[PDB]
Amino acid sequence: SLLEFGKMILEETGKLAIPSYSSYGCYCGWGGKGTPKDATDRCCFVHDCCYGNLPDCNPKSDRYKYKRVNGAIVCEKGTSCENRICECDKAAAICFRQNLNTYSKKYMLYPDFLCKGELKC
Template structure:
């Protein structure tokens, strides 16, 4: 019982850290019918952590645009702030995520391709487009 009492706050902290990413994943699933992992978490040159070079297609460009949207929110905790709509940051993060999810949906049939789902970073060439 003592171990459980100690683990509950720890687990709550871990869940808080990933809260926004989980919400974004739920939004992607609701909008596209695909789960964020594995379909978008490592897609192309910009979906997932980091990003460089030319986007491989319009779906990857959605991720580049999302990265740029987050870049404008430097004063916000884009990975951890949840959509509670109590602050401008929470609202703006949700708007960035919503725009990306809609972009994914709009490009699902025209450009999404499984060959880019686990795209190796070393294949990402060219100058990174400016935001």
């Protein structure tokens, strides 16, 4: 859920999930259309597609456990849905951290009309 995902985000980036990655570009939030605007926005698009491969699961309400071992995120052994959702969240949070150098305020509260079309995954 956003409780776990928001915690990895804060731990990895020093930023709060809402608002820093909930109103950013075309895909960081609940938007789902258009061409990702930059590297951070691409991390989000990938995260949506990741959740997309899990139609038997519900990421929004599915809570999992993770721990930090040797400085890295470990998704603890759980249900297939818990494991796969944790892995999607871990990947996006590290993606965010890796792209912090190009994170820009320019793309916060980004207008709907500048995001057009479907990119299927």
